[PDB]
Amino acid sequence: RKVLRDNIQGITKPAIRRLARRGGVKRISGLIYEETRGVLKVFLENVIRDAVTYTEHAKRKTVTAMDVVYALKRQGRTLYGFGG
Amino acid sequence: NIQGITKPAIRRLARRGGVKRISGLIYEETRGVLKVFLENVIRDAVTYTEHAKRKTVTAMDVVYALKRQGRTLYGFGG
Amino acid sequence: HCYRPGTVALREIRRYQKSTELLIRKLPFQRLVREIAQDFKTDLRFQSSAVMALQEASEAYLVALFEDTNLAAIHAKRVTIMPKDIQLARRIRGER
Amino acid sequence: HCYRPGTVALREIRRYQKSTELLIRKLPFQRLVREIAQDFKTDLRFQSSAVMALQEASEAYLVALFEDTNLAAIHAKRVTIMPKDIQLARRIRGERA
Amino acid sequence: KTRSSRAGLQFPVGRVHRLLRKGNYAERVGAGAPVYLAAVLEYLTAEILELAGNAARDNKKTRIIPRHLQLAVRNDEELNKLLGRVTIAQGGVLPNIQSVLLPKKT
Amino acid sequence: AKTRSSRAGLQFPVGRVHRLLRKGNYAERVGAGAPVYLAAVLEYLTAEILELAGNAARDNKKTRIIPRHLQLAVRNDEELNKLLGRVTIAQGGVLPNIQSVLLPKK
Amino acid sequence: KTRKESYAIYVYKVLKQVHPDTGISSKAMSIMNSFVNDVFERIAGEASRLAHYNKRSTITSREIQTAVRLLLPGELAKHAVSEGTKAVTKYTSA
Amino acid sequence: TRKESYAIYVYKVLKQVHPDTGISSKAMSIMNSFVNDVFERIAGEASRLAHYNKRSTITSREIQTAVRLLLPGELAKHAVSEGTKAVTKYTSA
DNA sequence: ATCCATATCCACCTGGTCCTACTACCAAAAGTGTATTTGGAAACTGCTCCATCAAAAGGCATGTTCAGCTGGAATCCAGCTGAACATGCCTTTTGATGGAGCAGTTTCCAAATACACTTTTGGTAGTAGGACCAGGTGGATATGGAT
DNA sequence: ATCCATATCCACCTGGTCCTACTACCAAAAGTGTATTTGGAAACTGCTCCATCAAAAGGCATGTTCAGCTGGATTCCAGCTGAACATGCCTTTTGATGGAGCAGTTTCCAAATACACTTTTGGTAGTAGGACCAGGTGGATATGGAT
Ligand SMILES: [Cl-]
Ligand SMILES: [Cl-]
Ligand SMILES: [Cl-]
Ligand SMILES: [Cl-]
Ligand SMILES: [Mn+2]
Ligand SMILES: [Mn+2]
Ligand SMILES: [Mn+2]
Ligand SMILES: [Mn+2]
Ligand SMILES: [Mn+2]
Ligand SMILES: [Mn+2]
Ligand SMILES: [Mn+2]
Ligand SMILES: [Mn+2]
Ligand SMILES: [Mn+2]
Ligand SMILES: [Mn+2]
Ligand SMILES: [Mn+2]
Ligand SMILES: [Mn+2]
Ligand SMILES: [Mn+2]
Ligand SMILES: [Mn+2]
Ligand SMILES: [Mn+2]
Ligand SMILES: [Mn+2]
Ligand SMILES: [Mn+2]
Ligand SMILES: [Mn+2]
Ligand SMILES: [Mn+2]
Ligand SMILES: [Mn+2]
């Protein structure tokens, strides 16, 4: 195991550009990308937490797709396609 | 009726919201928004009243309706 | 005259931000509620607490919508709220 | 020089708006997930479908956010989305407050 | 004879019943509640599968994929409002460009 | 002998929240410790809201709490404001907040 | 191996009724499963709250109906209430 | 009809908190609505918890996890310590 | 309006994915039949509180005038951001493996349920006492703003 | 800077809407004693699938150049909208009366539960075999945009 660091920069400028395109965005300022990462960090942090809170309650060490579905649902962004 | 909610009242509501200057067309748009809000809430509340086999809309019907609309209200039961 | 435009407007922003009273006259709001309810069921009567609750929730909703509306007007480098600001706020909120 | 600034952007809007593929590379997103999760609780494992679910949710949320943001930019008479647009959107939808 | 046939339904009345009491929504569950609920669920599935099948026919496809379910949901105002806070995996987005972003005057 | 809330050192009724957990159709069985825990948490949150509301009350030169004081307490505390982010306190009003670009002198 | 029930059989029947020459993908069928389970939980939850509000211990077809009216929008609510009523009258007619 | 409420208990906690302050009737009703609201939230989250794991009992563990899922950070930690403390005193009683 | 560098569209095609199809089995699900229990509909009706007047009182909405200052249009231009390119890297893909850990199965007891019975208490209801504070008054002084 | 005209605030005062104390009653809530049932924790281990490695290669990220045009700054002015009056409409109130109907009570039965047997079936797994579509090609057409 190697320490995991600075993986938010793995969300690349081209990827954020594609996500913005799917959003119908035409012109993107240079300061958007970092901003996006920030927002993205707040999103995952809030779902993953709840996810592992389920995983830890079931005395499990493996996060299931169902834990993600329950966390997303309790966050109000319920997701179809992965069970439940 | 919907015109009974006057422009001065809409102004006071907007000032509590921290608004300084108000367009002349704001008042009609506001009456429409308020009418939609009351239409949804009152619709669900009257659904609750009918299910209870009653003819008097209670404060608890409004509270339940508001809660399921995602706008829970403290101070009228529940 | 005396005061320049926008001064007593600020004065009333402070006045109504300090208080908690309801801002729409009771009777016209009650008539509106009864008219809107008449379309869904006839010969309906209301507990006074139900009407007052509807008014609390309504004026709260409208005050918040004017907060976000004012923010929308300021985003476009303006001070006057306009219908398109209310529309933008309601669309972002997920109501429109 | 062949295409005026903006044409290829509209072409890309049609391309990605027509398809459903994920737009963030899979492995970097997986590393990000394992980092965020590793900071909450060590020695965690993931089902592959849990990471793919986090992928789907994240990209859907970000796309919708970019739509509301684009509306924020256009509301200011701008074609270019800017951080103030994202902050206005997230503030209106009660995500930041 | 199953209760589904007894009610003229394809959806399982017995399963909806057992699920209604298994999820402790109340102490007791009347006999008509799973019939009504299975009927409603069946109607909704029929609606979305109709609109989605049309979406697949429009794209010259014979097998419905999530893209067709998304196209059906987001183009039907009522289904879109019903699933307003739901995201369909691999559903994508509706093609929509804001008019101001389009070119004009050469 | 002695009430369950007294044995738990609580002011909130353990037996009542136990009975309510039973009748609320939350689960088929309710352990003996769950009402103790829940009653304790409710008592703590009540203590927090009443504490901050009391501070607002003394700051407003008053001795008994009004809805305005509850609103000031909730909306000025970040975590209580997040917990009550979707609830409306009747007769609470709003916090004094004027956008800076609306003040005098441009 | 514990059995994992699903609505896929019934979704497939109602699929061959509406579009007889149209199949459905594994993913799309999964989305349909999540949809049926979701709507199920929403209906039964609103009905649970309904019975609790009115201090009844039984969930009847009536609570399911009021829950449908509270949950589904306009036309979907009307047609759903229609099909439900038809199904329970046909059921009790036997 | 016996109309139950959290009024007397909330008032007693108020006396433990601010012994010289009172509370209005409408504020009291707001407090009651708040206690009922948090009750329904924690109990519902706990019910969903026990259901997700195919369990038939709501234990103090379910209530705790639901508290971690509902309350913000510091409020969650404080509420958790209060709960485990009350359960510890109730057990050794 | 003509001509070119590119993108787009379509018919055709094929790999190998995605789906479907039988056979087989069975544990769980579902249906059927009797017996027992009971939730809650129905009928009655007491009393809470809701609708409707009556009827001044004057609070506040409405119409109007004037002009301040704001929104929006018109110009200019720096430098931000899109488009294209050359390079090469690290993600994607295919296949394999050890073994962690999820989960199926059986045992067994602490802990919850079910009931009877006693005790305690919180809620309702009068009747009565008390007091925090909203609203008003004087008078000081800070403030928006015109000179 | 001077100072006029309001707005604003602090000290004080008092009626009254409104809060706590105290007494009485009682259904129901809560506790306790005890006897039965059982959820699910422990222990064991089958079997899924997760982490990890290896290698090959090309899709796509990175970093750079160049300039088109967008945002932002500036200026200006037509015209909306705010601020103050003058009316006088119609909310507010409060006092009180019907009486609608909410809500408490008692009956009583259609329906729901509990239990036991029997039949059905939907799901899993093993094995085997079609077909819809993704990706690739090649040419025809369509499009941006320079001229
Ligand atoms: Cl507008
Ligand atoms: Cl910005
Ligand atoms: Cl417990
Ligand atoms: Cl029924
Ligand atoms: Mn870390
Ligand atoms: Mn072939
Ligand atoms: Mn009974
Ligand atoms: Mn002028
Ligand atoms: Mn300006
Ligand atoms: Mn230049
Ligand atoms: Mn290489
Ligand atoms: Mn092992
Ligand atoms: Mn007592
Ligand atoms: Mn007195
Ligand atoms: Mn005062
Ligand atoms: Mn001055
Ligand atoms: Mn006095
Ligand atoms: Mn067992
Ligand atoms: Mn490179
Ligand atoms: Mn421009
Ligand atoms: Mn009557
Ligand atoms: Mn079969
Ligand atoms: Mn193709
Ligand atoms: Mn052309």
Phi and psi at residue H12, in whole multiples of 5°?
-65, -45
Q: Do H29 and B77 touch (CB under 8 A)?
A: yes
Show the tokens assigned to C16.
């109504």
Q: Do E65 and G57 touch (CB under 8 A)?
A: no
Token pair 């909130």 in the structure block, residue = F12
For strand J, which nucleotides have at least one atom less than 7 Å from a protein CB?
5-8, 18-20, 28-32, 39-41, 49-52, 60-62, 68-72, 80-84, 90-93, 100-104, 111-113, 121-125, 132-134, 144-146
CATH of the domain at C3: 1.10.20.10
Show the tokens assigned to G82.
């229609």
Identify the three-state secondary structure at position G72: coil
Radius of gyration over every alpha carbon of chain D, rounded to an integer in angstroms: 17
How far apart (Å, rounded) are the C-alpha atoms in residues B67 and D9? 44
DSSP letter at A29 equals -
Count the neighbouring beta carbons within 10 Å of the beta carbon of residue E68.
27
Packed helices H25-52 and F67-76: angle between N→C axes, nearest 10 degrees? 40
How far apart (Å, rounded) are the C-alpha atoms in residues B14 and C80? 11
Instruction: Let me know if domain A1-84 sits in CATH 1.10.20.10.
Output: yes
Give bridge partners of residue B21 from the DSSP assignment. Answer: C80
Q: Is the dihedral of CA D84, D85, D86, D92 positive or negative?
A: positive
N- to C-terminal Cα separation, chain E: 71
Radius of gyration over every alpha carbon of chain A, rounded to an integer in angstroms: 16
Angle among Cα A54, A82, D54 to the nearest 5 degrees reads: 65
Count the neighbouring beta carbons within 10 Å of the beta carbon of residue F9.
15
Instruction: Let me know if domain B1-78 sits in CATH 2.60.40.10.
Output: no
Residues C8-22 as b or e (16 or more Cβ within 10 Å = b): ebbeebeebbeebeb
How far apart (Å, rounded) are the C-alpha atoms in residues D57 and D64? 11
Optimal mutation site among F49, F71, F88, interface B, most CBs of chain B within 10 A: F88
| Of residues D83, D71, D67, D73, the one with CA closest to residue D16 | D67
CATH fold of the domain at F1-106:
Histone, subunit A (1.10.20)
Residues A7 and D28 sit within 8 Å (Cβ to Cβ): yes
Structural domains in chain D (count): 1
Q: What resolution, expressed in A, was reported for this entry?
A: 2.8
Secondary structure of F15-78 in HEC code, one letter for each residue: HHHHHHHHHCCCCCEECCCHHHHHHHHHHHHHHHHHHHHHHHHHHCCCCEECHHHHHHHHHHCH
How far apart (Å, rounded) are the C-alpha atoms in residues E38 and F39? 39
Give bridge partners of residue F29 from the DSSP assignment. Answer: H57
How far apart (Å, rounded) are the C-alpha atoms in residues D85 and E38? 45
Q: Where are the domains of chain E?
A: 1-106
How far apart (Å, rounded) are the C-alpha atoms in residues E85 and C95? 12
Amino acid, res. D42: T
Furthest-apart CA atoms within chain E: distance in Å: 71
Show the tokens assigned to A7.
């993986």
Q: Where are the domains of chain B?
A: 1-78
Phi and psi at residue B74, in whole multiples of 5°?
-90, 145
Residues F3 and F37 sit within 8 Å (Cβ to Cβ): no
Task: List alpha helices for chain H, DSSP H.
Answer: 7-17, 25-52, 60-70, 73-91
| Of residues H33, A80, C83, B37, the one with CA closest to residue F67 | H33
Residues lining ion ligand 5 (Cβ < 5 A) are D 38-39
Residues A74 and A51 sit within 8 Å (Cβ to Cβ): no
Token pair 């009418």 in the structure block, residue = B35
Show the tokens assigned to D85.
């647009």
Identify the three-state secondary structure at position D59: helix
Identify the three-state secondary structure at position A62: strand
Q: Find the domain containing D21 and state its range.
A: 1-97
| Of residues A53, F51, F9, F35, the one with CA closest to residue H73 | A53
Domains of chain G by range and CATH? 1-94 (1.10.20.10)
Chains touching G, CB cut-off 8 Å, 3+ pairs: A, B, E, F
Count the neighbouring beta carbons within 10 Å of the beta carbon of residue D15.
13
Show the tokens assigned to C22.
């309801």
| Residues near C93 by beta carbon (within 8 Å), at least 6 away in sequence | C68, D92, D93, D94
